[PDB]
């Protein structure tokens, strides 16, 4: 039950710009890569809705993603509903800690597409 992670769980470091500060903030997140896109997500919503990184990128879509030692400059947007339903099962399959197949239906769980 290692899913798709083998012996190393993949995590991306997302840098967003503070919506009040205009200074960078970094957050480790699970992700998928889909061609040139990087999809990032949180696994919890409800009390954890609207984390700072998400609010930052809603205000300013320019982000950086570091995966291993690769650094990408990307632009972020919400996954559309179709994309939520398409990518969430892939995240469930990849990561053993993502277990609820239907959590994509809860809009308080952010799912963000970062593209070039």
Residue numbers in the entry: 36 to 151
Give the published text.
A deazaflavin-dependent nitroreductase (Ddn) from Mycobacterium tuberculosis catalyzes the reduction of nitroimidazoles such as PA-824, resulting in intracellular release of lethal reactive nitrogen species. The N-terminal 30 residues of Ddn are functionally important but are flexible or access multiple conformations, preventing structural characterization of the full-length, enzymatically active enzyme. The split barrel-like fold is characterized by a central six-stranded antiparallel β barrel in a Greek key topology with four α helices: A at the N terminus (the putative helix removed for Ddn structure determination), B after an extended loop between strands β3 and β4, and C and D between strands β5 and β6. The identification of these residues and the lack of classic catalytic residues in the active site suggest that Ddn functions primarily by precisely orienting PA-824 for efficient direct hydride transfer from F420 and potentially through additional transition-state stabilization.
Well-dispersed signals for 113 of 114 nonproline residues were observed by 1H-15N-HSQC NMR spectroscopy for uniformly 15N-labeled NΔ30 Ddn protein, suggesting a well-defined three-dimensional structure. This sample also showed significant chemical shift perturbation upon addition of oxidized or reduced coenzyme F420, demonstrating tight binding of the coenzyme and suggesting that this construct adopts a physiologically relevant form. As expected (Manjunatha et al., 2006a; Taylor et al., 2010), the backbone trace shows high similarity to proteins in the split barrel-like family of flavin-binding proteins. The initial structure was then used to solve the structure of the longer NΔ30 construct by molecular replacement based on a 1.55 Å data set (Apo-1 in Table 1) and of a 1.85 Å resolution NΔ33 crystal (P3221 space group; Apo-2 in Table 1). All but the first five amino-terminal residues could be built into the electron density for both crystal forms (36–151 and 39–151, respectively). The asymmetric units (ASUs) for the Apo-1 and Apo-2 crystals both contain single molecules with similar structures (root-mean-square deviation [rmsd] is 0.96 Å). This alignment omits 14 of 113 shared Cα atoms because of conformational differences in the same regions that differ upon coenzyme binding. In Apo-1 and Apo-2, α helix D is highly disrupted, with repositioning of residues 129–144 relative to the holo-enzyme structures complementing movement of the post-β3 loop. In Apo-1, the side chain of Y136 is flipped away from the F420 binding site, with the oxygen atom moving 19 Å relative to the Holo-1 structure.
